Structure formats: C-alpha cells, structure tokens
Write a protein that binds this ligand. Structure first.
Ligand SMILES: Nc1nc2c(ncn2[C@@H]2O[C@H](COP(=O)(O)OP(=O)(O)OP(=O)(O)O)[C@@H](O)[C@H]2O)c(=O)[nH]1
Ligand SMILES: O=C([O-])C(=O)[O-]
Ligand SMILES: [Mn+2]
Ligand SMILES: [Mn+2]
Ligand SMILES: [Mn+2]
Length: 620
C-alpha cells in the first residue's frame, strides 16, 4: 500500500488499534499524525482505569495536584496568559463573509470574526506542522447528548493535552461505546494542540503548556472541522462545548431546522403537583448555573437541573419545543459559589471534580472569593499563582474565571429526565443580563415577534469569561454574541420562522434583571434562591393567570402579584420603575446598533418591533 509505509503509525499506538477505527476516523487520525508528528498515539476508551492512569501521569508531570481533603478531586494552575476565552482570536472560515457575519454599515462587526480560507491556510501551516513533537496524540471519541440518541452528534477530538482528555471525560460522553455507535456515520473533526513541541524553545510557566502568541481557535462549518491551537483553557480546548455545541451546532441547527442556544434548562414544580420546564439565556458569568440549580425559598416549590449552559431545541410532531442538554457535566464559575448562593453546587463538586486556578488550603481543600466559609486556625492558603496568599492582600486567591469541572450525575437535584433522548417540553424562555439601571426586575413579551426582539436587544455588563474588561454595558443578543456560528440576521429570521410552524406551541418569553442597583450601588433584589418568587409569577402566567399589567415595554406583574412574604424591605417602586427618559435613550442605542451591525439582513418584523416600542415610549 506504500513504498516505505511512512503513513502507517500503528507502531506508535500505545492503546487501541487503528484497525478498529472506522474508515474516516483512521484517515483523520493518521493524516494529522503525519502533520503534527506525535511520538505516541493514544486511542481513548473512556474507562476508569485509563482515567486513573491519566491522572497519575499528570500528577507525576507536576501538571495537576491532588486535593486530599476530598474524594478524587484535583487542582490545576494554568499560565496567567491562558485563563479565559479570547474572542479576538476566535474565527469562523467561510467562502463568503456575509454567511458568517452581517456586513456592517459604519464598519467592523461585533457579531463574529470572519477569516477567509486563504488566510487560514497560511495561519494553519504556520502552527501545526510538527507541533506535537515528542508528545502523545490522544484520540477522544465523544458524543454530545445521550449516546445512541438519534438527536445526538458524535465528535472526534485530537489533542496533546492530558488535561483536555480528563475534562472531556466529565463534560462529554467519552469512550469506546461512542465509536461503536458512530460506525460509518459522519462526525465533527476536532483538532487541538497546545503548540509546545518538545524540546521546549520557550520556558514553561506553572507546567502549563500553551502558546499565547500563536493562539487561534478556528471553525470551518462547511468542512465540519474545529481547529484550535495554543490554549489549554476549557473554552478553547474542550472543543465539543462552545466550538461544537454552539458555534458549529447553530449553523447545523439553522440548516436542519432546530436550535442551539446558550441556555440553561430547569424543571420547576409547584405545590399543586404541576411541573414545567423553562430555558434561560444569560450571558457568560450572569447567573445561569446559580439559577439552574438554585435552592428555592418558597415552600412547596422544587427546581431540578437539566442543564446549565447549552440547550439543543427542536419542535416535535406534537408542536412542543423539545430541549436536551448535550453536555455531561458542569464547567461552572467557582468564585461566588457558597452554601447560601448555590448549596447544590457545593454538594456536587465534593468528589470526582477537577478545579482550575482556584486557591488551595493547607489541609487539602479549595478556596475562592465568596465561598463564605471560615477556615480553621492554622489553615493557610496558597493562591492560584502558587504563592502564599493572605486575606489582607490585594490579589484574589482565585482567578475571576476559575472553574470547576464536575459530573452532572452527581448533582443532588439533577432532573430525572436530563438524559431522556426525546427531550423535555419547554414552556418558557428567559432573557436577561446585568443592567445596573433602568431595566425592571421582570417583564413579559407581548408576542413571539416582540420576544425575539427582546432577545436581540439584550445588553449586559462585561464579565471575566472573555477578554472584555471594565464595567461597560455591551450588546449580547440572545447571550450569543461570542458564539454565533453564522449571520446574525439570518439567525433572527430563523427564530421568527418558528411562529410559522404548524400547531407550534410557542413558549412564553420573559426578560429578567437581577442586577438593578439603587443610587448607593447596592442591589435592589436579593436574588439567588429568592428568584423562585419571580419564577412563581412566570409559572402562573404560563397557566393563564390574570396577574399581568401592560406597560410600554411589555407585561409586568400587577400590584401584590409577586410573593414578597419575608422580604418586606424590598423597594418595589424603583425595582419596577419604567422611566420614559431612560427608555428613549435605550431605543436610540438599540436602533443605532441594529442598523449598523445587522444592516441589510435585519428582518422587517424586528424593525417593526423597534418602531412599535419607540412609539409606545413616545406616548408616555
Ligand atoms: N446579584 C446576583 N448575582 C448572582 C446571581 N446569580 C449568580 N450571580 C453571580 O454571577 C456569577 C456568575 O454565576 P454563573 O451562574 O456561574 O454564571 P453563568 O451564567 O453560568 O456563566 P457561564 O457559566 O460562563 O456560562 C456568580 O459568581 C455569582 O456571584 C444572582 O441571582 N444575583
Ligand atoms: O465558559 C462559559 O461557559 C462561558 O464563557 O459562557
Ligand atoms: Mn457559557
Ligand atoms: Mn455556567
Ligand atoms: Mn412572521
């Protein structure tokens, strides 16, 4: 078959067999093995023995530390230059720029970053040749969604990072069973490399292999390929999460007629024994995980978690909107997680959990800002910078974007249908972000078209999940600005087209704001478990209760319609105040934004909602 058998990497396989791979899987592995030149090839089987041996190797290489206070928990400290997503180095490659991003009017699009195929080939050939020299190439077969489910998509990731392999075992369904379900079927090609071939040219920091200078995360939807280079952080290296399940999946969803969204899925049950499922799209570090597994304060209410970050939704033959969580774990923000803000997350991360860039205590535990737990006498803290850290210092002991990686099955309130292949019926959709002023606590959209407009007009404060710093209010429509896989105008038209489906049970659409502050800078709403009071009103509105009052921005709860028992100290006037002067500026910014960023691809119905809202505000 060959003149020198130079394309036969079978001699470098330390686990598995190239003869046991499907045809297109073997070509994908051997092809990039020839390009990246790894010393070994490791075909993952997903077993606990492999996971155990993998952790031991990382512990011997100094990559991770063991947390002896907990059961099978591990800490990783990364290079300070590789701590979050880099939107400016995240690109999408299509033949036409207009397929990826709308051509702006004034210029420079904020709805994505497009790179031509010619430029990407130059960038690709300047990075990957010989990039895995002296390292092991791990072959990761993983399924997004329940295995064997016809509504699940299978991926193959190639990486030279054992930290990525362990995290993908938690975040996805990984192992040999995925290759058997795959067969000769298609798969998304995922190629990742830390970009530090051996011997090292540059000195390594915190044993974290990364190349910040050449960092690039590329998406090729026409070729169904994800190519990421130079970063170890989960958002850039766990390719089945943001890269596949959002960016690549959103384009596939548009083509096939479903939805891939940056949304949590929760099930809520009332004291009358009636349960409904809701979805909520909040921007990064805006409260999805806390809401998806909150501890309700109202007696007789129970909330169960289906997912906390990614939802795949599709209308069924009965007209219901069915959603699944394609993930297998929680990659949640660590700081702020305490027993009072998220006790269900505390119970989950007790075991089998990988932490990244959180502080370690001398007794083998974890620590971060907002953990709200005093330490015993004698217990010292080592910060995420691997330095002696004291409470009276300026630098935080944990990075603001530090994460835990925990299995979703360990969550105490995990929904008993979170792995159901048919999905859960969604009866409501929630938008919202961080607005310190103007936006009331909750309101309801007037129609489906107005609801789609509400998602498109979302604005929020910047967080630590990306590279955007400061307290500046940015646009983040549908909480998908960093994750749009294709033209946002076409994305809006795809959402609007759902109203044209036969017998489609369109969910109700709400908008919330947990973060409205007073004149002194403190929150008007306590939030966290108290958000069950807001969910109670949405539940009643879905049942058709006459609890709404019409406003120029939509329906708000009537007077005494919210349950405020126990919270008599809440100022309801400023919390639901709708100022005409504030909303005249708001429609001005939304108009200038949509006209510039969406331009000729703006659906008329979204334009009509903007015009109708501006008219209702002018009549105040
Ligand atoms: N004031 C207030 N802050 C909250 C509330 N819920 C969460 N937060 C804060 O917001 C931060 C973000 O929490 P998460 O739920 O992990 O954010 P997320 O929406 O899941 O973001 P990603 O996981 O990156 O997609 C937390 O550290 C909390 O401190 C709330 O109800 N009220
Ligand atoms: O990491 C995340 O989940 C994000 O950035 O939304
Ligand atoms: Mn997210
Ligand atoms: Mn989250
Ligand atoms: Mn229409």
């Amino acid at each position: 078959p060959q003149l020198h058998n130079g394309l036969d990497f079978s001699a470098k396989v330390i686990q598995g067999s190239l003869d046991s791979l499907p045809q297109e899987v073997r070509k994908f592995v051997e092809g990039n093995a020839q390009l990246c030149q790894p010393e070994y090839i490791h075909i993952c089987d997903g077993s606990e023995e492999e996971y155990g041996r993998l952790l031991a190797h990382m512990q011997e290489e100094g990559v991770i530390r063991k947390l002896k206070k907990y059961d099978n928990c591990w800490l990783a400290l990364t290079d300070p230059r590789d701590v979050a997503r880099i939107e400016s180095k995240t690109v999408i490659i299509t033949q036409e720029q207009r397929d990826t991003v709308p051509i702006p009017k004034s210029g420079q699009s904020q709805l994505g970053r497009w790179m031509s195929e010619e430029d990407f080939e130059k960038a690709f050939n300047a990075r990957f040749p010989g990039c895995m020299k002296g390292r092991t190439m791990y072959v990761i077969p993983f399924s997004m969604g329940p295995l064997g489910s016809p509504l699940a998509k299978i991926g193959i990731e190639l990486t030279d990072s054992p930290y990525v392999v362990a995290s993908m075992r938690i975040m996805t369904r990984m192992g040999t069973s995925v290759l058997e379900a795959l067969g000769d079927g298609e798969f998304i090609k995922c190629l990742h490399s830390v970009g530090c071939p051996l011997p090292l040219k540059k000195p390594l920091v915190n044993n974290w292999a990364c190349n910040p200078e050449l960092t690039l995360i590329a998406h090729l939807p026409d070729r169904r390929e994800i190519i990421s280079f130079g970063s170890g952080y989960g958002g850039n290296s766990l390719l089945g999460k943001k890269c596949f399940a959002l960016r690549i999946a959103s384009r596939l969803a548009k083509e096939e007629g479903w939805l891939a969204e940056h949304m949590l899925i929760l099930g809520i049950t009332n004291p009358e024994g009636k349960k409904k499922y809701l979805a909520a799209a909040f921007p990064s570090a805006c409260g999805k995980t806390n809401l998806a597994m909150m501890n309700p304060t109202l007696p007789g209410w129970k909330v169960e978690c289906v997912g906390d970050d990614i939802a795949w939704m599709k209308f069924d033959a009965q007209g219901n909107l069915r959603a699944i969580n394609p993930e297998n774990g929680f990659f949640g923000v660590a700081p702020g997680t305490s027993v009072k803000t998220n006790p269900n997350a505390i119970k989950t991360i007790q075991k089998n959990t990988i932490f990244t860039n959180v502080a370690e205590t001398s007794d083998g535990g974890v620590y971060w800002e907002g953990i709200d737990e005093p330490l015993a006498p004698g217990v010292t803290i080592t910060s995420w910078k691997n330095k002696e850290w004291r409470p009276q210092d300026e630098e935080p002991c944990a990075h603001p974007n530090s994460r835990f990686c925990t299995p979703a099955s360990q969550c105490p309130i995990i929904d008993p249908a979170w792995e159901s292949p048919e999905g859960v019926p969604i009866e409501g959709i929630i938008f919202g972000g961080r607005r310190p002023a103007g936006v009331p606590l909750v309101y309801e959209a007037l129609s489906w078209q107005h609801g789609v407009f509400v998602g498109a007009a979302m604005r929020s404060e910047a967080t630590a999940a990306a590279e955007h710093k400061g307290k500046v209010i940015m646009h983040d429509p549908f909480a998908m600005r960093p994750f749009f896989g294709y033209n946002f105008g076409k994305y809006l038209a795809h959402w609007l087209s759902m109203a044209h489906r036969p017998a489609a049970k369109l969910p109700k659409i709400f908008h919330v704001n947990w973060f409205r502050k007073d004149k002194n800078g403190k929150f008007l709403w306590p939030g966290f478990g108290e958000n069950s009071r807001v969910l109670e009103w949405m539940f009643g509105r879905i049942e058709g209760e006459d609890s709404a009052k019409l406003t120029p921005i939509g329906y708000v709860p009537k007077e005494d319609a919210l349950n405020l028992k126990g919270l008599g100290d809440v100022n309801v006037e400023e919390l639901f105040g709708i100022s005409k002067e504030f909303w005249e500026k708001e429609v001005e910014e939304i108009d200038k934004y949509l006209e510039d960023q969406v331009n000729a691809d703006l659906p008329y119905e979204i334009e009509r909602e903007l015009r109708a809202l501006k008219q209702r505000i002018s009549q105040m």
